[PDB]
Design a binder for this molecule. Structure first.
Ligand SMILES: *Cc1c(COP(=O)(O)O)cnc(C)c1O
Ligand SMILES: *Cc1c(COP(=O)(O)O)cnc(C)c1O
Ligand SMILES: [Mg+2]
Ligand SMILES: [Mg+2]
Ligand code: NA
Ligand code: NA
Lengths: 401, 400
């Protein structure tokens, strides 16, 4: 059965325009297409493949649970999901956990819980959600209404009401929207899709005190920043500000579809029998893989390793920048890194990313003006250097093209 | 340390009260708990495990793709997901496919599409969704609002507006709510959670005619009825009524998390670049497993074997009933079957399910009044008979 890139244009609902080449296998941070062409993968599954492609221990954990059973639905619990839940509890501020299949699902759960909590303790009039312009929280109607790209919601109106958007990093802007009718504030600790913008420490403490004063739940959407991405297990640990609810997905599963809502006891108590659920969520196959991911990522050597790899990327992006004058700045934390184009190259991140693919390196964008790097947290130093040589070659061609 | 059932009550957010025992491995339609106790599984992963537990070809397909790569995200397509798309297109009214990770994400995609379609062609104001009381379409705010059980949506208001609910199987009920302002009519061909109640043929044909007259998209939610469950690949084929959009998940991936929206070319055209998305949807791992599920399920022999199995359950359930006087009726289609409790035992489905489980057979409920069977499509004759023996012994303990 022959499969060609032109078949994509015929068979898929056309919401993505993907690369002209089709990957068939990978290993660590290398990936190969149907013709044998090789790419260093700095796109990292969009900050999902925290341990790279075809990781041998993730494969062994997959196969070992797959040969026992995969799924029953949540009428029956299972050992891997319980052990996963306990790892998450032991490692974070959480007392309890809910599992689902994607970051949007995790965010739906955290916003539902915040609505119910407010309604049960104060009255059903306390429904307001404050989110931030340029945030990304998912594609379901509710989560795309919470995110701050109105282009991604207007077509699907009427939207769920009582949501409004403050400017990121702007505490007065947030303060104007949060009041005693607010149930939740949802914020990414780094706006990933929004250009790799880190929140400042004052901004997050400011949301924590505003949530305290007005009794609203503070929700950190760590679906991109989570699971080692920043050099700590979760970003809130880097920042020292503790949320009431934390969502996690993407790198949680190292590539297997999984996500989770982390909650304090007080918040968890609110969600009684039958008030929420999911058919696939919490199956033992997901749970056995995520379990293994946490075991391999949440170690001092791997997390310090992410701080080390940060500097490899940044020192070398600086020398590339010295040669080609492309970027006003390089920002981010750990291995979520954005290269901000300057005025002479404004809105050209995607063209750079396409040249980079031609030169055999996968990178992402973050809005049209930022080139994004989200490589595997175990990428090797050889893979970082060879991928950046290719990125530097692609920048050279670009600077004439 | 060792995991206990009690840990479940300390660590999980308490949305489910799961069984007292904890499964640890299974094969076909048998499953075993941590103490070695054996169950015949007629729950079938809530109509998900169409091939049973730990299926060796599903395993082989999983491990073979897992040794190439699992995931890139949708900036790059892959061969498994394109092959799976083609299988679905060749086998259904669909021309194009979107992939996601759950039946709710599938229904989100479908309702979004019908919104944009109507908006783009008619205007901002044509936004109405008609759904049916007792429907279940998932747990995202939008899908749980489309669902017809207000008890699962109320707490999370305000709910997305322009949604209304008609009485299932009631053509004039639906006709009253569907006008030129309706963008979509979503409906399950058999209501699963709402008691294993099949649509009638005139009801579906009637929704199709009304959708056509008022230019609204007809969405079939086949996440429970689809992929072989009724004895045809999709229940629409059984009824002979073709939707514009169809959603599928659960049995799609035989236990691996996957879902999909099937669309006609005209409908697919409205979703341009960046208008919807998913990080994990269409990954090659789910795609490889779901491809192999379709290969094994969509065969004359598996599907005719589902018709046969229907008659094994119904004939023996009628025999059990004749003996114990529990139910007023055994209904459903294929291997989605509900035993409706009589007046005397009304509201007791869960107690009969708990008794079943003590006797070594897993069954589900569908509302407090129906006992629901949704076993693997390849359940063997011997599994049906041993599980139904243990169901008989459970009905006997229960009836007293
Ligand atoms: C990608 C992402 C989501 C949504 O994830 P899916 O798994 O695509 O549903 C939510 N939040 C953030 C911060 C993300 O980067
Ligand atoms: C279970 C189910 C859904 C929701 O699927 P999830 O994978 O649980 O999100 C939607 N529709 C029907 C008919 C279902 O049975
Ligand atoms: Mg309540
Ligand atoms: Mg448009
Ligand atoms: Na904790
Ligand atoms: Na077709």
């Amino acid at each position: 059965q022959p499969i060609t890139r032109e078949n994509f244009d015929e068979w898929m609902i056309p919401v993505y325009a993907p690369a002209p080449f089709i990957p068939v296998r990978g290993e660590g941070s290398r990936l190969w297409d149907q013709q044998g062409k090789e790419y260093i993968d700095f796109a990292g599954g969009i900050a999902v493949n925290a341990l790279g492609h075809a990781h041998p221990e993730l494969r062994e954990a997959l196969n070992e649970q797959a040969s026992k059973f995969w799924h029953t639905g949540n009428g029956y619990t299972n050992e891997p999901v319980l052990r996963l839940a306990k790892k998450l509890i032991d490692a974070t501020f959480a007392d309890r956990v809910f599992f689902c299949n994607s970051g949007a699902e995790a965010n739906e759960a955290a916003l539902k819980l915040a609505r119910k909590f407010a309604h049960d303790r104060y009255g059903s009039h306390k429904s307001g959600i404050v989110a931030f312009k340029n945030a990304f929280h998912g594609r379901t109607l509710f989560t795309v209404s919470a995110g701050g790209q109105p282009a991604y919601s207007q077509d699907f109106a009427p939207l769920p009401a009582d949501i409004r958007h403050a400017a990121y990093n702007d505490i007065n802007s947030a303060s104007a929207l949060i009041d005693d009718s607010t149930c939740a504030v949802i914020v990414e600790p780094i706006q990933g899709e929004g250009g790799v913008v880190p929140a400042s420490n004052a901004f997050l403490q400011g949301l924590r005190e505003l949530c305290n004063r007005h009794n609203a739940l503070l929700i950190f959407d760590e679906v991109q920043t989570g699971v080692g991405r920043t050099g700590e297990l979760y970003a809130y640990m880097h920042y020292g500000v503790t949320p009431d609810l934390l969502t996690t997905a993407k790198a949680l599963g190292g590539g297997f579809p999984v996500g989770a809502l982390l909650a304090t006891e007080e918040c968890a108590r609110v969600m009684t029998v039958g008030t929420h659920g999911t058919t696939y969520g919490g199956n033992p196959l997901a749970s056995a893989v995520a379990g293994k991911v946490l075991e391999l990522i949440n170690t001092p050597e791997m997390l310090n390793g992410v701080k080390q790899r940060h500097d490899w990327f940044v020192e070398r992006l600086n020398t590339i920048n010295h040669r080609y004058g492309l970027f006003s700045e390089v920002r981010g934390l750990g291995l979520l890194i954005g290269c901000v184009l300057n005025a002479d190259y404004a809105g050209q991140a995607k063209q750079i990313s396409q040249e980079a693919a031609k030169a055999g390196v996968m990178v992402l964008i973050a809005g049209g003006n930022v080139v994004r790097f989200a490589p595997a947290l175990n990428v090797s130093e050889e893979e970082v250097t060879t991928g950046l040589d290719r990125f530097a070659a692609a920048c050279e061609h670009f600077v004439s093209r």
